[PDB]
Amino acid sequence: EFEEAFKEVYEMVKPKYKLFTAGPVACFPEVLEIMKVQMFSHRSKEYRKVHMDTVERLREFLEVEKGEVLLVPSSGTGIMEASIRNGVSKGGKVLVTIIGAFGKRYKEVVESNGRKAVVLEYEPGKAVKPEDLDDALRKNPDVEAVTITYNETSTGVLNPLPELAKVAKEHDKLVFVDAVSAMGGADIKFDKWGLDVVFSSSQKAFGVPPGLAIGAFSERFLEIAEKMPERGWYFDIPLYVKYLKEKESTPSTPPMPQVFGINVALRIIEKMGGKEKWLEMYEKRAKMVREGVREIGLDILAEPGHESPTITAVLTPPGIKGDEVYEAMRKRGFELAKGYGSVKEKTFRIGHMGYMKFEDIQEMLDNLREVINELKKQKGI
Amino acid sequence: EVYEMVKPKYKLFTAGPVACFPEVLEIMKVQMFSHRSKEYRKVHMDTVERLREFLEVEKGEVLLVPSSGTGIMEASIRNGVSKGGKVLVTIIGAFGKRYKEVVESNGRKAVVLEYEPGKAVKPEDLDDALRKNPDVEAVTITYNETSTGVLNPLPELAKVAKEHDKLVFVDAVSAMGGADIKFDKWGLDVVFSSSQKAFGVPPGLAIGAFSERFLEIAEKMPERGWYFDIPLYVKYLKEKESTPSTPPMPQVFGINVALRIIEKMGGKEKWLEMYEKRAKMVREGVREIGLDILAEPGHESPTITAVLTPPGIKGDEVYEAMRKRGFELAKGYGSVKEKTFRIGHMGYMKFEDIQEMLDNLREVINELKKQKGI
Ligand SMILES: *Cc1c(COP(=O)(O)O)cnc(C)c1O
Ligand SMILES: *Cc1c(COP(=O)(O)O)cnc(C)c1O
Ligand SMILES: [Cl-]
Ligand SMILES: [Cl-]
Ligand code: NA
């Protein structure tokens, strides 16, 4: 009846580019289709069934048996905040490992919530070393938890989580993991690696629209949380666990479309053969992108052996800014990602998450080569 | 596979989420892109601007937040009330109780002014409560209590609060878009809503409006966090025309479509009159069946009605009975979930759909009475 109301907004949001973004990312058509289904009550038997099926699929995917998996109505950073209000004493110290922009965000989340942050920082492109963590924990024995950015989206680096988590546990510390750009793209074995908190978002490796956060919490974390004073209501983890058990839903209204979308995404992974084959696909995309930029004669930021399977930070040739590549590719129909953080000018990024065909990547790379050559000639280099 | 579990199977008269317009559902499936792109910044600001217009906000700030409405309920407390500070929480239903829970769980103290389900807060009672509670920093008001179908006299209540120089926090989750709101004019300091009620958009997004006074306090408020740091959201809106973290883009697009629909129908005035017309139709419809509502005279909600079931009949029975007829109403909520069931009148629903729902409700009531020997 109000076609024009729809058409007016469509003109602003209609598909314009082939997406190689850092999040949100291109969603699979099956996911987009479920996003338009009519709503109904989140307290209904119909919804409770879907909410729980999604949680079950995530417990399987994340290999969680002893801990709890929750769906939260917020972006991933919501659980980042939750980890601090629930698992660290007021004024308590947190050893925040920083290898990029999001490690810095965790620090801000720690401090803004009344906790203290002890930093172990590296230059963009480097990954945290287990030996340095052990060293840091040695001289900072009063810290209660350690945060690890599994996949640093600003640098295209994947931290060696298993080994880092091992070291943290040897010091009997809580392990908090920001896996926003890692979950669904890099493996996570929650119980086995001894993680206490891991969180992610719907709009990265899972290829679902933004609006939902996914969290997994250990028994150890939950025991501390239920006794943690003034942790609030919106991110009261024990409250969420109680609602999941009793009402098979969330305390407040959940982002239903995104939940349906994640369920579809999990079924897609199952259809293709399971988690292993899905992660294999991600590694093949990453490889193709890295090898492709290498052919063009460009270097990447990530140190060898720690390259991200979800995104690559490419260093621009001398005299060219990341923004210039971003804008030039857009004019050719390709949306990459601007550099982020302290390397925003010396790099641009290429995401390889969500709906992405190998042929589209190849086409993107051929256009990038021309963009690079043209910018060089343009500037006389 | 998933479509089977979520496919449409009921005519919706829910308490939230609600039935969304076809236009809104269609925009919900558009492909995503960066929330840091020029394309998204344009849509984010257009939506915020249409909301500032709708809410009549000029001096304050309007924000879109990645959370359900309760998220801003929490934000109001962490940003506008000193730690250990006192808040006068007015309660007339289940959600007033939630605000109380949010106040206490965040380390603040709640002073309660509570009424039995069906009643509305009286400006005179609020005035007396405030005189006896001088240390109170803010007053919370549930504009539209969804569990009882009651609309509080916000303008008059906000008036009293300001007379005592208190901050005015308003839970308008089931009110915004269904009952008028004049932010600047009424002196409100915080008002928040969700996408899944009167606006008829899927859940996942929260809307908030904040006054200069509130922001001044928030900026100096220690340890208010990051996710609900209002001044941070204002800064990102101003500089990045987006949110600090990733926003629920589909729902933002949906709210924009919804606001354009309101415009195309004649504007806010005509939209609100449409809501009152719908509510009046439901109230007379149930009263014609021989039923009464819970809301006290003059405080009937334009978005939802709490209907008292006949003696011997539970609200749940009517809910399940209607479901078998293809109609989805709402179970009673709170301490009256047995004596009442609810009929929401939000989102997409033609007057004819309401009539068809009312006719089936009549047969359902008689069928229930008959099987119960009534
Ligand atoms: C994208 C991202 C975040 C923020 O996720 P949101 O959903 O916007 O809150 C945090 N950490 C990392 C590593 C990310 O890539
Ligand atoms: C539905 C409702 C809420 C909660 O809204 P959410 O989006 O689920 O957080 C709060 N208050 C009232 C009056 C409501 O109707
Ligand atoms: Cl609810
Ligand atoms: Cl961001
Ligand atoms: Na602009």
Ligand code: NA
């Ligand atoms: Na602006």
